[PDB]
Amino acid sequence: RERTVRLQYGSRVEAVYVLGTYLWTDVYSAAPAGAQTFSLKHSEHVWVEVVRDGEAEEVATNGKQRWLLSPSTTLRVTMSQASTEASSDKVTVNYYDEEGSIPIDQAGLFLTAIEISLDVDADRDGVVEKNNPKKASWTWGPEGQGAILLVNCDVYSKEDLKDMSQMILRTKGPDRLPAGYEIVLYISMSDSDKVGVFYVENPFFGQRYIHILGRRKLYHVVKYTGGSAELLFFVEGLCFPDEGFSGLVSIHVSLLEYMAQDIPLTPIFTDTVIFRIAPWIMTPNILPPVSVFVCCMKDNYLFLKEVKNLVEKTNCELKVCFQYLNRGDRWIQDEIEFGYIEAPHKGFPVVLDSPRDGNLELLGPDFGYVTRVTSLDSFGNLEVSPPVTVNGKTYPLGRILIGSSFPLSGGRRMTKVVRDFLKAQQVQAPVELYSDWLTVGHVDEFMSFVPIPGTKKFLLLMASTSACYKLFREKQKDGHGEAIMFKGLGGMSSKRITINKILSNESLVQENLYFQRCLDWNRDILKKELGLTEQDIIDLPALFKMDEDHRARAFFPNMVNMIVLDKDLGIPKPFGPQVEEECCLEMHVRGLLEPLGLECTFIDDISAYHKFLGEVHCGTNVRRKPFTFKWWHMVPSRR
Amino acid sequence: RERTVRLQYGSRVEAVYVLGTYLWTDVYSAAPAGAQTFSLKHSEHVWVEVVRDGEAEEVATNGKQRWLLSPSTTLRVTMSQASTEASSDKVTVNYYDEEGSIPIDQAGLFLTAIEISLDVDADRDGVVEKNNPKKASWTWGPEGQGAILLVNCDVYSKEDLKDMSQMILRTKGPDRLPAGYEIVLYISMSDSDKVGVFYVENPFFGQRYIHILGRRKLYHVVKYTGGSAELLFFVEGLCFPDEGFSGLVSIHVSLLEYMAQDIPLTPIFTDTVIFRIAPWIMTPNILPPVSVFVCCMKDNYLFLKEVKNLVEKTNCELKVCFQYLNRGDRWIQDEIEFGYIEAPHKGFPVVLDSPRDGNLELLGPDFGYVTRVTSLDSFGNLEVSPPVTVNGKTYPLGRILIGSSFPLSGGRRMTKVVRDFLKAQQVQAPVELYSDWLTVGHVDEFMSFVPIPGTKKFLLLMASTSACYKLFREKQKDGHGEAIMFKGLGGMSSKRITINKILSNESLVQENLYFQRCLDWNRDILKKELGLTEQDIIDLPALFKMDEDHRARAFFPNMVNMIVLDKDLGIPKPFGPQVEEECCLEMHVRGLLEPLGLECTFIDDISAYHKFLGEVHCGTNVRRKPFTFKWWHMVPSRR
């Protein structure tokens, strides 16, 4: 960076020189009228070149050389080290007329060199490197650079700032700035609701960190100390990327020069750092489970016992929650979504919370919390796929899946606010599916993903009505038509539901053929958008009843919405027709899954209610370890 | 794209097959209970593979082959040509039990194959190619693809649609769609204020083009005709990219299947095209001039005569405009900005118009018009550089320059609406300069660009107060101190302004040293952001007076704001001190410019007023040929 500094004759110009720049200096304007040639002297640590018509020659500290005065003959002035108290850094230009060799006048330039660098961890290793040449830009990918900021998801203490990003103003120079200069850190009005910055303003009086930049504070004057100094700042993100906010914010430092009263100060030098605020990332079922969270009524004893036994097979911890006045019976599934954020050498799980009636809970200090309508707004209507590659395009964090209706249908859709939020995170490249054929309208009623044990691969599990009808027709042919559904649920008994009764219900057959079309439309989108083939899919038997809106509700519990802990699957107990004292649905599902090394445990969430009307009264959710792949190494498509 | 189509037993499934997809077909669900094996027949133009556990084998039209019935054994069905009236396209599956070789049941699939493709000129040659594989994406650069739309800048006639983009729905098939299908073209609500689409709905009754998609119309059912058919649509953009709008819009066509009353229609097949709306592009002074526009009062005879003589030296045409009640005296410069838009084989000049008092003009049908506060909002405060390369980064269309104040100054700034508009065009990557030290606050008061004749290079011209003082001091030393400014302007005469009077004014010297600092701050930004060195810059003498806000107004006309027609420069006549009966400012400027092959003509815009107070009462603007470089070949930085 070249900076213009002009001389003034019979006089002196004093300037601050910032290392990393150089000055170009007009000597011709300060020349007295009638002056013909000039000569110059300079101090030891100032380097001076005479540049005439583009050609630069180095000039000695004291030579007697003279050059013709011309507007196209200028000086270039460079300094490689900061001034100290021992410095006298200067350049002196002498002017001559034709008549003689004694100077007729002189113009000086007195310099104070300082180093000023606003530094951040741009190379993404957790340490703040000195003046990364790329710190003012932010690029994606394995070779990408620029600093990363976490949203704060939770006078100040340093301990409380542990989650924030460090930013360091590094300076070097003499005891004080020359008269009429100051250093100011600042942000734009636009970024003021995106960031905050903390600093100890008065270190002689204690360690108190104060909030110096953010809402209503756009600039802060920072004190200069001499010698080699560092000022430590902590920076927080205030919000995630969203529809109108890309995630990028900038912070500037400027050396300002006082001109006079009533006139703005001149920005002599400006240094800039950029941060990207880390996106919220959802964890698919293939990631290692850490904790299992469940909610149910206190007396659903079978559910609790069976979930405990499942979790005991694993190294996971179980967290049990009961029901709240402000939340649905499924809230741990519907109102909470587990995700994470990550920065170099920092990261934590972050829960999205959308309470049904609003907030009046939380499990643990380890989590960050982001707190916010149709049933499509539920987090039961959100899933995320395992990492996939689709037609050469890699989605290393997987893709978020959101249930919706057909574009021209006039049906329900998840609120734009949430859809836009998920899209703005960019790294999970969301896909809309079709959930609106379901009364409740959640993708988790029809699909799930499971890892294939001993491999790096996974399966898509799809609810299938065709599979249920095939199985029931086989069992009927085998002489089992009188086999009864819902054994042990006393509130169902009077209905006497048998395989025969189901198969003879003509309207129900038609309804379920239609629901199979709905499932298949989704199957196709999933195969297209996830790059899946038929070998990646297993169909689980399912059955639905139709409501007045022509929408589906489960006839028996949807087995697809299951607890996935690696090889171990907690599967809703279906209460299917008993053949030889085993549920034919359980046996069929075992026959599909067990050969793949998956271990099935059926979990009874309905016995405590004595019947099943299509609604499940419990919920589960799993906190998982984040992906090994660092999100900033992705190269998302440009928008 | 693989699509799921299942059989149903003892019965027939009829389906439409869209060319370019294929069907995967479950034969196992239609198998009667107890059935063991299956066999199949198919027609000549249907290709059928049996796929078992991933392994596909082609099956003959009539073989007797039998396969074990399994859920993992399916059919893949492919057709390579559209059905005609001569087609019977089908696949028939026979099922067998253990007991014998006569089929116990059969399930048919009857097919009607159609071609459906929504086509646009994605490869950017002006012709609509058949089904470009990349038409659903939009990529920048030499190899980039996807279709381009122009904003319309001006029952319908086809002639009136000449400026719009063509979009063609190409179909092939039998006489009619099978029962229960329709084809629908549609857009999102969001895009509905970005685009419009026109089509002849009733070609038997005439050629009337009607507006079928746009505000309040999100979908249109289009009639299917048999055989090979094309439906021609015309598409317009409604607005330029802006803060919340990237410029990308999408149009979809879907084949919809009727399910039943009260149930949404199923999107069987969907095809999508994307368009980018072409940005507004500003033309720098290096581009060939076409027309010169001037505004002045009818009696400024010298200005008119001298501008006419200048333009007569060139092949340009002159357009003369007088003053209007709703517009400033400079309006052709301040309220109008000339730019263009371009699409493959189409483009026109487009004027931005921001009338002072609002609209109540226009010159010519050849232009598009975009019609919309401090003085910084004026188009005199906008410039655009010639193409530059900065640290390896190429700006093939140049960069827009916008005058502003310092970030912390609390000074004036161009309105966000305009700044955001210019930024959103993306291809000119705007840079903010510092104009707020000027009373009027326009970058055109201090800088301009000129081409260097006989080369591909250009110069930055900067106003310089230091150059003026140097020149005046020289002339004083030479014995010319009593030389008078403003000769011939009778309203200035009583002031008796001479070189001596100017040089002895101490406050004026200080003011102009400060203004030179302001000019130099800009010089530095321009060198940085345009990749310029001192060899690319010429300083023209200028002088200013300071107002109560410490802002500058011209002491004598600013020569830098000049008419640039290639080698010929119309330069405001400065009315400088006369030495040997020539203006020393004119002679100095000639001495700078003429050696470079630039021809200078001084244009007197103030004599008709008898004095000069810092305000010029005329304006000029030049319509230029667009860049040869196609904007869509740029690769702008991602945001």
Ligand SMILES: [Ca+2]
């Ligand atoms: Ca680092």
Ligand SMILES: [Ca+2]
């Ligand atoms: Ca979920």
Ligand SMILES: [Ca+2]
């Ligand atoms: Ca084409």
Ligand SMILES: [Ca+2]
């Ligand atoms: Ca302009």
